[PDB]
Every structure is written in C-alpha cells, then in structure tokens.
Amino acid sequence: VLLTNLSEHMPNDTRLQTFLELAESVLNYFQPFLGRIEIMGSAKRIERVYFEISESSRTQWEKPQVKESKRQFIFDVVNEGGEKEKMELFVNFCEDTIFEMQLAAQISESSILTVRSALFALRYNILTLMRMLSLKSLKKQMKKVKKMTVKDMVTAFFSSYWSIFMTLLHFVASVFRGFFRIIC
C-alpha cells in the first residue's frame, strides 16, 4: 500500500519505478487485495484512499445473484433515480448488499458421452478414408493406368471428393446412431 501510494503520487520518479520493478511480485500478490477510491477531502481537495479488501468479500461480490441485483439497481437508478437521492439509494443498496453478503458467507463456511461418441465417429470415419492410401491400391491403379489419360484423371479427381462426401454421410449416420444409443 505504501509503495502504491508513492507510485500514484510520484508518477515521474524513475527510482520509484525501479523499486516497483524490484517489488513487482509482492504487488502482483496484493493486486486483488488493494482497493482505491476518491473522496471529496476535508481540505477541499480530491483524496485517494487505500484499504484492505477481503477475498471473501470479493467472492460474494462476484457471485451471480449479487450481480443480478446490482444490474437491477443500476436499471432502477438510471430510470427513476433523482440526482439528490441517487447517492442515498446507492448507500442503501450498499448496506443491504453488505448484510446479504455477510449472511451468505456465514451460511457458507463449513454431454460428455455425446462429445466422445461424436469424436470417436470422426476418428473411425476418417481412418476409413485414410485406409485407401494406407492400403496403397492407388499404386496398382497407377500401374494399370501408366498411360496418362485426362479422362481417367478427371474421373479420379471427382472420385476423391465423392468419397469424401460418402465418408461424411457415414459419419452423420454413425453420429445419429450413437446419439440414439445414448438417449436410449
């Protein structure tokens, strides 16, 4: 807290950033804990205040129901909130939130099958197409069609994507079969 105060009031001093670099790890650890606000000071000047924030307070602040209540409060204050009573409604909300926070903490102390089926279907429906190159029938195809023909070459070029489409159809059918087995 002392180092952060010095950093925020001595912005340009290079020796101070050297100390900050030396002590980054402590500051990294205490980043969630340190909290800062600005208040209208007694000397008629804006003052920055640093204080300790409990990680329990942070957690019960970040719980979803508190977030929904905060959003509803924001909606209400934006829509039908007066400039005089805005700050007062905020304080009342803060008090109620703190009480419910403490009560929550006090009471507090002390798909995968379908995904796997689809992945396995992918694997054994793509290895089926890999198996032509694995079984090297294209080599004997080349031996029997050593005479280069544009007719045959275009036919094989089409057949490649035709086989890809058949593998996709088998994949979709396998996925549907696996999903039906899962549900039943």
């Binding site: 909290g35 800062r36 600005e38 300790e52 602040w61 934006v78 905020f90 803060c94």
Partner: protein, 96 residues
C-alpha cells in the same frame, strides 16, 4: 418501452461515469482513461468494499480520512462522494 429503457441504461453507463458524472470524452483524452477511471479511480465495488471495511474497523484505530468519512456516513452527509470533479481534473497541471 422495456427495450428503450435497456438502451438508455447502456448508453448512460458507456457515456458518463456513474459516481462523479463527468463525460467519457474528457477521460478518453488520455487513451483508455475512461474505463481506467471507472475501474480504478471510481469503482462501485470499491466504494462498497470501503463501506464494509470502515464498518468492520474499530473506532479508535481509524485514520483521519477514515474517521472523517465515518462521521459523514453517520450523519448521512454524502458530500464526500465526488461530484463533478476527480483526481485527474484536480491535478491536470501536475499530471500532464
């Protein structure tokens, strides 16, 4: 009406800071200064945590600032909340 109210809430929060009420453009003159201000300088959660910490703290252990804010909170005087001014506005000369 419901949808327009949601749009108004979004526009108000992205155009002006909730606490002090200064427009986003003045803070955004410095790069990313608007959300920097709304997330560190003036944070709703930070004010709530400060209220909690001040309530839980003992009386005689209070510092001067903490005791002064405590007295205003007891008397329900919200002048300590910044209004129309901020640290950057107060120290435009020195900071820049």
């Amino acid at each position: 009406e419901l949808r327009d109210q949601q749009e108004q809430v979004k526009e108000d929060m992205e155009t002006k800071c909730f606490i002090c009420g200064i427009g986003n453009d003045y803070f955004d003159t410095v790069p990313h200064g608007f959300e920097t201000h709304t997330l560190q300088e003036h944070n709703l959660a930070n004010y709530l945590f400060f209220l909690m910490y001040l309530i839980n703290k003992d009386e005689t252990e209070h510092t001067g600032q903490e005791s002064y804010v405590w007295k205003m909170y007891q008397e329900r005087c919200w002048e300590f909340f910044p209004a129309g001014d901020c640290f950057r506005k107060q120290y435009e000369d020195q900071l820049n």
